[PDB]
Amino acid sequence: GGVKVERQVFGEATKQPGITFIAAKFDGILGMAYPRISVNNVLPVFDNLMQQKLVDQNIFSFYLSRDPDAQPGGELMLGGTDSKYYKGSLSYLNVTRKAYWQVHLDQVEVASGLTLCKEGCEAIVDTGTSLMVGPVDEVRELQKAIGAVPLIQGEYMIPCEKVSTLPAITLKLGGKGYKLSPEDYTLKVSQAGKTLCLSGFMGMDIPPPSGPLWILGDVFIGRYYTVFDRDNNRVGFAEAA
Amino acid sequence: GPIPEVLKNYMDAQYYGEIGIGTPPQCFTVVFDTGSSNLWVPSIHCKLLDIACWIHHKYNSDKSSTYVKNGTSFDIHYGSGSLSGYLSQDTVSVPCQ
Numbered sequence: 001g002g003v004k005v006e007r008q009v010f011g012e013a014t015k016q017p018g019i020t021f022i023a024a025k026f027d028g029i030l031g032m033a034y035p036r037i038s039v040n041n042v043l044p045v046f047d048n049l050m051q052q053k054l055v056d057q058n059i060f061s062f063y064l065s066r067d068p069d070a071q072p073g074g075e076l077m078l079g080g081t082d083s084k085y086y087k088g089s090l091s092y093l094n095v096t097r098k099a100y101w102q103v104h105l106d107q108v109e110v111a112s113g114l115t116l117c118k119e120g121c122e123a124i125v126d127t128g129t130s131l132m133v134g135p136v137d138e139v140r141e142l143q144k145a146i147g148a149v150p151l152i153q154g155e156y157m158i159p160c161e162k163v164s165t166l167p168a169i170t171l172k173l174g175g176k177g178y179k180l181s182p183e184d185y186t187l188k189v190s191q192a193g194k195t196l197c198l199s200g201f202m203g204m205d206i207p208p209p210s211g212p213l214w215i216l217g218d219v220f221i222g223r224y225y226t227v228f229d230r231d232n233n234r235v236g237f238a239e240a241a
Numbered sequence: 242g243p244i245p246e247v248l249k250n251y252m253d254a255q256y257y258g259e260i261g262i263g264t265p266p267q268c269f270t271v272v273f274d275t276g277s278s279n280l281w282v283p284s285i286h287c288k289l290l291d292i293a294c295w296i297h298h299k300y301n302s303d304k305s306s307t308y309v310k311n312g313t314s315f316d317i318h319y320g321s322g323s324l325s326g327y328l329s330q331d332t333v334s335v336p337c338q
């Protein structure tokens with residue numbers, strides 16, 4: 001297997017400001033959102049794939065491993081699903097605005113009682129964001145309800161020792177509740193090391209006109225195997241195995 | 242059939258996989274980002290100011306027989322990083338095959 005997407009326009013980066021890519025282990029980015037948010041209306045790679053009729057189903061799925069010492073680290077499957085990485089059945093949600101993979105979140109409930117996004121809100125499913133992110137005010141309430149402390153700039157830390165005492169947080173998507181236990185939403189980090197767990201929710205306000213928006217990053221896609229469907233503009237989730 | 246791309250996992254924070262640009266394929270690692278829609282890799286003509294480019298793989302157009310120039314400039318600002326360069330055309334392979 002291997003696909004050859006022919007005649008793809010892509011950018012050759014000549015200036016890349018700041019620290020942000022000095023620290024990145026990857027060389028570049030292959031964006032997989034819809035064409036509306038494409039700089040210079042350059043047809044995306046998967047749009048090019050669909051057009052050259054290179055796969056049977058115009059879908060692609062993401063399995064991401066949440067243990068960094070695991071082989072493989074995750075698996076993107078183009079044009080299909082890989083049932084060796086999820087349990088049960090896919091439950092789908094329709095894309096509300098066709099630009100990012102935008103889905104409607106019904107509410108975020110942290111089991112100690114607090115319910116955020118009551119009234120419902122808009123969320124995007126982004127494999128390029130590590131953490132879950134939400135509006136600064138709701139995420140500070142959520143962090144206080146779980147007892148994490150501020151690190152800096154919307155990120156919070158919790159003692160890794162303290163993780164088993166923590167609440168589970170449930171995001172309710174399309175009527176179903178998807179549960180993140182304390183081990184799903186906290187990341188172990190090191191320099192001196194360990195005992196330092198990040199709280200997996202970052203508080204960041206995304207301005208109108210696109211925002212506000214919650215972002216369901218790799219923290220969520222790591223518990224729930226994700227299916228992006230270009231044929232029917234919907235997202236599907238199942239418990240990752 | 243479905244095409245499997247194996248991803249590497251750096252610290253549960255960065256997941257990236259390998260792809261090729263050009264004939265013959267020059268291999269790069271990219272994050273398959275469902276939050277954007279552009280594809281970009283470092284140019285071998287990246288400026289000295291681009292420190293990031295010194296430590297990554299850079300694409301060389303003159304080593305690809307299927308390269309078609311475009312030259313149009315582009316500027317992408319992520320909610321974190323910013324970059325710019327010019328656009329180009331060539332084959333993309335996934336995996337580096």
Ligand SMILES: *[C@@H]1O[C@H](CO)[C@@H](O[C@@H]2O[C@H](CO)[C@@H](O[C@@H]3O[C@H](CO[C@H]4O[C@H](CO)[C@@H](O)[C@H](O)[C@@H]4O)[C@@H](O)[C@H](O)[C@@H]3O)[C@H](O)[C@H]2NC(C)=O)[C@H](O)[C@H]1NC(C)=O
Pocket residue numbers: 009036040041042043311313328330
């Ligand atoms: C470099 O790249 C390309 C190939 O080498 C060429 O440039 C680009 O060509 C594409 C077509 O493939 C143009 O995009 C099209 O745009 C039209 C119009 O867009 C409408 O919708 C937007 C918002 O969605 C709206 O703002 C506009 O006003 C329009 O109402 C679409 O109908 C097509 O589907 C497609 O998206 C690009 O515009 C163009 N980009 C640039 C920067 O020029 C070009 O051949 C190559 N360049 C050179 C110099 O050769």
Ligand SMILES: *[C@@H]1O[C@H](CO)[C@@H](O)[C@H](O)[C@H]1NC(C)=O
Pocket residue numbers: 092093094174
């Ligand atoms: C999705 O959209 C269809 C029409 O395309 C609608 O009838 C259906 O009930 C929606 N379902 C979900 C799960 O969003």
